[PDB]
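Appendix B. Extra example for self-study. Work through it before the problem class; the solution is given directly after the inputs so you can check yourself.
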Amino acid sequence: IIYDDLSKQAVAYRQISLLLRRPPGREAFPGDVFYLHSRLLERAARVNAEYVEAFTKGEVKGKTGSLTALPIIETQAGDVSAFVPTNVISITDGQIFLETNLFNAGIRPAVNPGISVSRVGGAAQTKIMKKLSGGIRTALAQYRELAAFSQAASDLDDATRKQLDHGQKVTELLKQKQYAPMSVAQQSLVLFAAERGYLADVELSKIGSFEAALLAYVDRDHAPLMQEINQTGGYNDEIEGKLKGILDSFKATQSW
Amino acid sequence: AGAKDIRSKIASVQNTQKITKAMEMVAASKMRKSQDRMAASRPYAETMRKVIGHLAHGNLEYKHPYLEDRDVKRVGYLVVSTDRGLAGGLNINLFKKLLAEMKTWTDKGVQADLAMIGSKGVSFFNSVGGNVVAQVTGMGDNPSLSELIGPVKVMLQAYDEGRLDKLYIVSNKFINTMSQVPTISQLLPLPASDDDDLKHKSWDYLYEPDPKALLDTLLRRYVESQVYQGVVENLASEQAARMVAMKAATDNGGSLIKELQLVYNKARQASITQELTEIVSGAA
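Solution. Structure tokens for the complete assembly:
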């Protein structure tokens, strides 16, 4: 379930409540504005099979149902510390923070690491995704901070240089077109290529081409592995070896 | 904190930003004038070097203490620094490179020796405790060779007395308008510059009064000239470094204005909301 703007709902409760003369609080919302978004969102949940069985009078056995919620909040000037944004951050299991400076720089989708978090944890993710992703999040946050200080003065010590190159290539690798979804096999190949070092010798202006060619290469020849990884998200040494062969052979044999 | 004093801060930082922009413009222009003064310093030194090559690599190649190579027992550095701040790390980078090499020689048991141009280096190596035997300061943006004569004469006296075996100049190099680098180069004993020609057969100088006397005066003038060239290049490097530093400062000041204004506007809106809540909830 998607809620397109909970901030506009909060405005609506402001209008009804103030028209009923209820005394306002911070930013003129009622204190009941926490309870509003609380009881709405708290319905979204996953329920155990005993509840499903008791509810449906035993017509469904052993299954477990769920409702997944992606609420949307519009916030002024990127201020994450205003009242209603802070209330909803206090209710969800995490947030995805989109930064206008990244978006204007053409880095899209403009996800900001460090502020964005998923408090549920890696339990949601599949095995191959969890193993290949790992510390990519904090590496990106640290790359951005390092770029902040590197802009200020010149102190380059060769590991800083390679950290910067890696971070810049990863950010160029993360951007993606609108209405262009890609499956877990494609995502896992992309992450594998990024973190097993294969993007060495590859230009930043070539990164998008490198991906287009690689996904076409794996769609053409080693398709059965794609079917396997899309069926079960299993990370084995056998599958790592196959991926290693695919990336070795692509990097050595193909062009982009 | 409080929106009236926040607005006061905003005005103050805006005024600061204007003045740093002005300083960037001025630094660029001064860089231009000092790099014109740099080119005029070349011809004197280079024609002097052609004469010195004619005599020193000619068949009349006298063995002069300035011209000969001997084992290092003591070593000296002539060091150029600014009289003025806001130049970024130019002085500190140069001093770090100097500290590295000065450590390397003194581990060989070699006593170090220092002569300082500009007051920043004087203060720095007084804090470090370096062995400073001569200094000149307050030349500002109008250096002159006659002022350099003192420290270089001291170092030269120690050199031909045999006390110092090698003598460097420590200075930044104005490689580009956009980039500069700290350097250490040996000025005594005379480096083995290629400086080869055989046309001297056709025009051999009539040495009045003596050849060796003229050669000594030429070497002394050459060392003086090289020191002046290094000083002028370090001045141009100072102007370029201050230019880039003021550019960075102006940008950071603007980037701080854009945050203080968000704080101010949020406080403005909150104050209006709270006062009007008190008034409306105050009635009846």
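Self-check: Strands of chain A lie at 2-3, 70-71, 94-95, 117-118. If your reasoning did not lead you there, revisit section 3.
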